[PDB]
């Protein structure tokens, strides 16, 4: 009887403590909170702990106090949710960061293998996802239905963002390990190097061929963002070949500034200079020569640039 009277009224204290946690009632929580009830569970509903409730209802101060007074970040509700799940599911950024700083497991799994990132991503909590991913959330972990966190994002904008962030963090790690093959691999899949599937041209071939007056600024930008200055299309033409044959001198200067190989050979063994000579572009030939184009190079068909050009070209190429 004495052991049962204490337990019975202790069970009423609990319900009041849990109420104080959900409501945000600081004074009441601290009057009721002891070392013996800090990690109690509700008898009904989810069977949440005070910290689950504080976390879910964005009671930042209550969360802080609970953590300071021995609350367990690893405690489960009836479905295996930890308080990190609750915070993430309702987009409570500051709570999430606090729980993470006190050692909450970023990839904690409930009974259905839902992580906090599954919760954040499914409810469109974009900044929370970024924070989770920043703390080592793995968006390739699958739940019990085989679905990743990326699969649960309800908009393609969020999927795109989640994919960006996880790829970014993975690049950083690969860089720390000087994993040449893995950095080489992931940079190959960046859109800057996208190849037209038949013609094999990149954005840089397209830019230097453009008839629009911003072509110089576009080529400059592509090259700053990592475009291969010497990329070959199906015919082994570099952007330099493409520009020279059209007399697009402005973008030829950009290519030269970014270290274009002046004597790169197309599938006929021709340089950019052969192509400019053949088209009769006199100033283009002159520019190419000033950039170190070698006029002595003989094509697969047996011709130098001068042998393919008119008199004015032959003059340019000797003077």
């Amino acid at each position: 009887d004495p052991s049962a009277k204490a337990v019975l009224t202790g069970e009423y204290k609990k319900d009041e403590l849990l109420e104080a946690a959900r409501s945000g009632n600081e004074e009441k929580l601290m009057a009721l909170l002891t070392p013996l009830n800090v990690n109690c569970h509700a008898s009904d509903g989810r069977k949440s702990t005070p910290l689950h409730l504080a976390a879910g209802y964005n009671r930042v101060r209550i969360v802080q106090l609970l953590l300071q007074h021995g609350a367990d970040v690893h405690a489960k509700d009836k479905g295996g949710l930890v308080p990190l799940h609750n915070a993430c599911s309702y987009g409570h950024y500051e709570v999430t960061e606090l729980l993470l700083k006190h050692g909450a497991c970023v990839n904690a799994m409930d009974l259905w293998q839902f992580t906090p990132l599954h919760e954040a991503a499914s409810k469109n909590r974009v900044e929370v996802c970024s924070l989770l991913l920043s703390h080592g959330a793995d968006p390739t972990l699958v739940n019990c239905h085989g679905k990743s966190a990326v699969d649960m994002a309800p908009t393609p904008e969020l999927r795109e963002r989640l994919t960006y962030e996880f790829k970014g963090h993975s690049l950083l790690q690969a860089a720390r390990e000087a994993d040449l093959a893995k950095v080489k691999k992931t940079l190959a899949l960046e859109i800057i190097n996208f190849k037209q599937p038949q013609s094999h041209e990149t954005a840089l071939h397209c830019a230097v061929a453009s008839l629009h007056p911003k072509r110089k600024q576009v080529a400059e930008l592509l090259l700053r963002k990592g475009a291969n200055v010497n990329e070959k299309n199906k015919d082994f033409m570099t952007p330099l070949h493409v520009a020279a044959e059209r007399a697009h001198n402005d973008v030829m200067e950009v290519l030269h500034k970014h270290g274009a190989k002046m004597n790169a050979l197309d599938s006929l063994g021709q340089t950019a200079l052969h192509r400019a000579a053949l088209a009769g572009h006199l100033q283009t030939c002159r520019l190419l020569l000033s950039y170190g184009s070698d006029p002595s190079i003989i094509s697969l068909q047996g011709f130098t640039a001068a042998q393919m050009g008119n008199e004015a070209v032959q003059q340019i190429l000797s003077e």
Binding site: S48, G56, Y57, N58, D77, D110, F114
Partner: peptide, 12 residues
């Protein structure tokens, strides 16, 4: 058997 799709908490 079926996962309850609501944890304790609410949007702020």
């Amino acid at each position: 058997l079926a996962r309850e799709s609501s944890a304790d908490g609410a949007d702020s």
